[PDB]
Amino acid sequence: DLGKKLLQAARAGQLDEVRELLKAGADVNAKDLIGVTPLHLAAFSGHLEIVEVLLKASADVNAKDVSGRTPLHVAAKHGHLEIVEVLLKAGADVNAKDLIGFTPLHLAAQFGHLEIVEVLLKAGADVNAQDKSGKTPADLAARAGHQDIAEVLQKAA
């Protein structure tokens, strides 16, 4: 199972092994049971070089796991600014919504990643996007105590 070994290499941050498995024929979009792909796992663990290798191998940058999250959601939630930037350059959907209505901007605002908030805004993120409870990214920032981010977002409204 090359797909499973690729999921493990991507999660573990094994750059050489990811390249060899891709050359051997591993499905770049292999999925585990919750539907996460090697791109999701590399974004999760902050492995920038693996993300770039996966993108060059035509990984689907907007693949959604069963929660509806894309790799951009993952990278934005976990603070990985360089990965957010490379995903955006590859065509990641800055306004993709998961099953609770969160965009990547919701997650960057909720988890207090101001630099990522600024990058997403430069990429056209919708500041007025509402989740399924009606809440905007600025609402989430305020709720989590990140007043500087809420001010930036309310300024951009």
Numbering used by the authors: 13 to 169
Q: Please, what does the article write about this entry?
A:
We established a process to generate bispecific designed ankyrin repeat proteins (DARPins) that simultaneously target HLA-I/peptide complexes and CD3e. In this study, we developed and characterized bispecific T cell engagers by combining two highly specific DARPin molecules to target the tumor-associated HLA-A∗0201/NY-ESO1157-165 complex and CD3ε.
The structures of NY_1 alone and in complex with HLA-A∗0201/NY-ESO1157-165(9V) were highly similar, with an overall root-mean-square deviation of 0.4 Å. In contrast to antibodies and TCRs, DARPins do not contain cysteine residues.
